[PDB]
Write a protein that binds this ligand. Structure first.
Ligand SMILES: CC[C@H](N)C(=O)N[C@@H]1C(=O)N2[C@@H](CC[C@@H]1CCN)CC[C@H]2C(=O)NC(c1ccccc1)c1ccccc1
Ligand SMILES: CC[C@H](N)C(=O)N[C@@H]1C(=O)N2[C@@H](CC[C@@H]1CCN)CC[C@H]2C(=O)NC(c1ccccc1)c1ccccc1
Ligand SMILES: CC[C@H](N)C(=O)N[C@@H]1C(=O)N2[C@@H](CC[C@@H]1CCN)CC[C@H]2C(=O)NC(c1ccccc1)c1ccccc1
Ligand SMILES: CC[C@H](N)C(=O)N[C@@H]1C(=O)N2[C@@H](CC[C@@H]1CCN)CC[C@H]2C(=O)NC(c1ccccc1)c1ccccc1
Ligand SMILES: [Zn+2]
Ligand SMILES: [Zn+2]
Ligand SMILES: [Zn+2]
Ligand SMILES: [Zn+2]
Lengths: 102, 100, 101, 103
C-alpha cells in the first residue's frame, strides 16, 4: 500500500521542502527520512504511504516518534522502525484520544 | 462531576424542551445516558465527564456512543459496568485512526 | 407571522422562567416584556414572534436593545418600540456581522 | 494593514493550493487572485489582508463576489475591485446577518 506514488523516494520528498519555513525547529532531512513530504501550507507534512498528516513542529520533536504516536499502523513506519518501537511509543501515550477530546 | 446542576435525570430532561423533532435519537435515551442538551444543533454533553456528542443518526445508541468516545467516564462505568465499556472498545479499536 | 402562538402572552412567557438561573444578572420580567421566553437550557431565550434567540446575558444588558441589535425586522419589536428606536440601535452597531467574524 | 505578511504575493498564495481537493468546483487561480490562501483543512481559505475566512465552495461561486459579500471593508478587496463593485454586491445581499440567524 502507497497513498502517493510520486513521493515514494527520499529525493522527491526533499524537493517539496524548497519553500519550507526557516523558523520551523525540525529539519527537512529528519522529516523526509520518516516518509513525510511538504504540502505547501504552514508546517503541514503528509506520509507518502499512510497519508497521515502532522503539523505544529516544536523544538525537540522527532518525526519517527510522532509518526508512531499518531499513525502506528503505517506499513512504511513498521518496515523501517519495527513493531517494538511502535509498541513502546504507543505505551508512552495511552490516552491520545482522551487528550484530543479533553 | 463536571456539571453539578445536571446530576439528576429531571434536570437533563428539562434542557430537551426545544430539541429538534427531526433528530432520530429521542431525549429519553440521551438523558438516561447522562447527556443534557447544549442549545446548539444536536450537541449534547455528559454531566460527569464533560464529553460532547453530535450528528445523531437513525439507530445510534447513546450508551454505546458514550462507551466508544468517553470510556473512562465514572458515570458510564457505574451504570453500564467495565464489561460493556471493554466490549464496545473491542468493537471500535481504530477510533483515533478513523478521525485522523 | 408569529413563530410561537402559545408564547403570545406575557403570562405564558413568565411561566417558562420557573427554572431560570438565579446567577443570571438580567431578570425574567425584562425578558418576557421584550417578547422572550426561556428555552430550558443555559440562559437561552427565544422571541415568540421572530424566533430570534439570545444567550450570555451580563450585568447591564437590556433585552429591548439586544432585540433591535440582533433582530431589527421583528414585527413585535417594531410595534412596541417603534422604527426610531430600532434605527438608533442599528446606527450604534453598524458592524455587527463584521464583529462576530 | 495586512494580517499575513507572508501571503502578500500571488505566488505564495498559489503554493498553498498544491494539495487542494480536486473535487472543489472553484479553481485556485480565482481564489489566490482574490487574496485567498489555503488554510489546510477542508476547502477553508483566508484573505492575507482582512483575515476573513470562507469555505463550502460550490459550482458557480465567484471568490471576488464572496469576498465583497462577507468582508466588504477589506482594504485589498476595495483597492482591486473598487467601492462600486462592493456596494452593488452589498445591495444584492441586504440581509446577510439575518440569513445566518434564520438558517
Ligand atoms: C508533530 C508534532 C506536534 N507537536 C504534534 O504532535 N502535533 C499534533 C498533530 O499534528 N496532530 C494530532 C493533533 C495534535 C497536534 C496538533 C498541534 N499540536 C492529530 C494528528 C495531527 C494533526 O492535527 N493532523 C492534521 C493534518 C492534516 C493535514 C496535514 C497536516 C496535519 C489533521 C487535522 C484534522 C484531521 C486529520 C488530520
Ligand atoms: C453520536 C453519534 C454520531 N454519529 C457520532 O459518533 N458522532 C461523532 C462525534 O460526535 N464525536 C467524535 C467525532 C466523530 C463524530 C462526529 C460526526 N460523526 C469525537 C467526539 C465527538 C465530537 O465530535 N464531539 C464534539 C462536541 C463538542 C461539544 C458538544 C458536542 C460535541 C467535540 C469537538 C472537538 C473536540 C471535542 C469534542
Ligand atoms: C444578549 C446579550 C449578550 N451579551 C449577547 O449580545 N450575546 C450575543 C448573542 O446572544 N447572539 C449573537 C452572537 C454574539 C453574542 C453571543 C455571546 N455574547 C448572535 C445572535 C445571538 C446568538 O448567539 N444566538 C444563538 C441562540 C440560539 C438559540 C437560543 C439562544 C441563542 C444562535 C447561535 C447560532 C445561530 C443562531 C442563533
Ligand atoms: C464561499 C461560498 C460559500 N457557498 C459561502 O458563501 N459560504 C459561507 C461562508 O463561508 N461564510 C459565511 C457563513 C455562510 C456560508 C457557510 C457555508 N455556506 C460567514 C463567513 C463564512 C464562514 O463561515 N467563515 C468561517 C471560516 C473560518 C476560517 C476559515 C474559513 C472559513 C468562520 C466561521 C466562524 C466565524 C468566522 C468565520
Ligand atoms: Zn505513514
Ligand atoms: Zn460521561
Ligand atoms: Zn422578536
Ligand atoms: Zn480580505
Amino acid at each position: 500500500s502507497i497513498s502517493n506514488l510520486s513521493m515514494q523516494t527520499h529525493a522527491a520528498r526533499m524537493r517539496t521542502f524548497m519553500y519550507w519555513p526557516s523558523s520551523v525547529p525540525v529539519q527537512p532531512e529528519q522529516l523526509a527520512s520518516a516518509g513525510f513530504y511538504y504540502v505547501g501550507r504552514n508546517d503541514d507534512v503528509k506520509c507518502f504511504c499512510c497519508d497521515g498528516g502532522l503539523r505544529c513542529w516544536e523544538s525537540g520533536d522527532d518525526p519517527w516518534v510522532e509518526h508512531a504516536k499518531w499513525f502506528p499502523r503505517c506499513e512504511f513506519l513498521i518496515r523501517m522502525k519495527g513493531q517494538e518501537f511502535v509498541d513502546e511509543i504507543q505505551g508512552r501515550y495511552p490516552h491520545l484520544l482522551e487528550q484530543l477530546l479533553s
